[PDB]
Structure formats: C-alpha cells, structure tokens
Amino acid sequence: SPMYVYESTVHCTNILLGLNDQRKKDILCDVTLIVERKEFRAHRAVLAACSEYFWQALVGQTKNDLVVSLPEEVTARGFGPLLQFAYTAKLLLSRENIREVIRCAEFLRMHNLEDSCFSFL
Amino acid sequence: GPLGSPMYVYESTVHCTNILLGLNDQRKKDILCDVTLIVERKEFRAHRAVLAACSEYFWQALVGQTKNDLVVSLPEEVTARGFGPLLQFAYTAKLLLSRENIREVIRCAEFLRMHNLEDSCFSFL
Structure with a gap:
C-alpha cells in the first residue's frame, strides 16, 4: 500500500534544453x-x-x-x-548589451531583473 | 562576435521550476x-x-x-x-x-520512451 516517490533533479533542465533546441531549429x-x-x-x-x-x-x-x-x-x-x-x-x-537588456526587462515588466543580479565569471 | 568580455552573468536556480509550474498550471486550466x-x-x-x-x-x-x-x-x-x-x-x-499501478505505468513509460527516469529507483523490465 505504501508510495514510491521519484523526484528528478535533471528533468526540468532537460525539458528546457529540448524546448530551446526546438526554438533554434524552428x-x-x-x-x-x-x-x-x-x-x-x-x-x-x-x-x-x-x-x-x-x-x-x-x-x-x-x-x-x-x-x-x-x-x-x-x-x-x-x-x-x-x-x-x-x-x-x-x-x-557584456558592456555592449547589458544596459539594453536591463531596459528591455523593465518594459517587459520582469520583476527585479536589475544591475545587482549580475556576477562576474 | 561580442564586444567586451561576456562576463556579466546571471543564472537563476528557480527559473526552470517556475516555467514548469506555469506550464503545469496552463495544462490544468486548459x-x-x-x-x-x-x-x-x-x-x-x-x-x-x-x-x-x-x-x-x-x-x-x-x-x-x-x-x-x-x-x-x-x-x-x-x-x-x-x-x-x-x-x-x-x-x-x-x-x-504504488504496488497497484507501477507495472502499468512502467510498461507505458517504455512504450512512450519517456526521458529522465533513468536516475530513478525503478527497474524497466
């Protein structure tokens, strides 16, 4: 009667990789x-x-x-x-597009996608 | 290619989960x-x-x-x-x-060739 549980750690990322691949090939x-x-x-x-x-x-x-x-x-x-x-x-x-990306994100109303989200490689 | 080092990074550890929840929500609401x-x-x-x-x-x-x-x-x-x-x-x-449906689900997973089940506890026979 007990339940067997699987939670996949890779599934979401693999789904997303699949969808991105589809996007790139249209x-x-x-x-x-x-x-x-x-x-x-x-x-x-x-x-x-x-x-x-x-x-x-x-x-x-x-x-x-x-x-x-x-x-x-x-x-x-x-x-x-x-x-x-x-x-x-x-x-x-990079320095070329960071400003425009941030400015775009604010227009598309993406909450708290700011300066301070970013880190250095 | 790019101008400047593409060194300004943000990786979201919630993003995927969030997309998948939005998708499941879309699915249930049709x-x-x-x-x-x-x-x-x-x-x-x-x-x-x-x-x-x-x-x-x-x-x-x-x-x-x-x-x-x-x-x-x-x-x-x-x-x-x-x-x-x-x-x-x-x-x-x-x-x-559970014991009640496992065989039926596993059999159905092989037919569909469902991905991302290999890291699971379940045998596929």
Whole structure:
C-alpha cells in the first residue's frame, strides 16, 4: 500500500534544453514575434509562463501562424538575450548589451531583473 | 562576435521550476495548450512541444504537425491508468507510484520512451 516517490533533479533542465533546441531549429514553435524588424520564433506557452506581459499578449490569440509585433521600446539587442534566458535560465552579457537588456526587462515588466543580479565569471 | 568580455552573468536556480509550474498550471486550466490527447477514450490537454521534449514516441508523432487544432489518438497500449502519472511526471518532474499501478505505468513509460527516469529507483523490465 505504501508510495514510491521519484523526484528528478535533471528533468526540468532537460525539458528546457529540448524546448530551446526546438526554438533554434524552428521546430514545433507557434508564434513569431517581430522585434525591431527581426523575427523570433518561440512557444507562446513558454513565454507566458515567464511573464504576465506575454500572458496578456498571447492568451486569446487564435490564428494559423500567429504573429505578434512588440512596440518600439523593445529592441532586438535587449530582447534576444531575454528570450534565450526564458529558454536557459541563464543571462550572459557584456558592456555592449547589458544596459539594453536591463531596459528591455523593465518594459517587459520582469520583476527585479536589475544591475545587482549580475556576477562576474 | 561580442564586444567586451561576456562576463556579466546571471543564472537563476528557480527559473526552470517556475516555467514548469506555469506550464503545469496552463495544462490544468486548459489555457495556452495546443494538443488534445485521447487515451482510452479520456481527453488530456497538453503542449505538443512539451510532450516532444519528454518522450521519443511523442517527438516522432508530433514533429511536423503545424496545425492549430490537434487531436492525437494513442493506441491501445496506452491506458489512462499508466499514462496519467507519466503526463504528470512530464509536467512536474515527480512520479508517484504504488504496488497497484507501477507495472502499468512502467510498461507505458517504455512504450512512450519517456526521458529522465533513468536516475530513478525503478527497474524497466
């Protein structure tokens, strides 16, 4: 009658690696975001999981090949690493893009993604 | 390549868990889902991308399915009793079994070729 329990330490990370690989090959994606004239494929469900901003942006949408344009405040240079972060749990930035990424994150209303989150390699 | 050392790092130790909870939540509310699985005449809402990442059987059944409304009938090997805990595993990283259903679930896991069960206590025979 007792219960056997398994909690996988690797599963979440492997799922995420799988989804990121899909994104990079544009396999099984469902939304095209246009960010400052650049196309980015993603899974709306992953995006809406990370943020209320994308939740409201993507919940109703009932279209073949959905296409959502982000406003001018969101640039490609700031968004790219934030999209990749949603798929890896990792941000790795340099002097070139750190400001824009942080500024993008505040527009996309990501709580407490600030200066002080970052560390040195 | 980059300008400057890409040396400014942030790694989140909650991020993955958080995504997976959001996905499981989406699944249970049936919001932002995209496939309906029919298993022994029962319906399960899910995300094809998530199934494809967890299961080789689902990968190969689902890659190239571009259509919006998607219903997928699983064969008779897949029972509701053996699949239920597996779908939940896929969505939470946790598998809870007893003597009553273990064989049925394990058998179903081999058929689906479910990933990330090898570090478990369970034999696959």
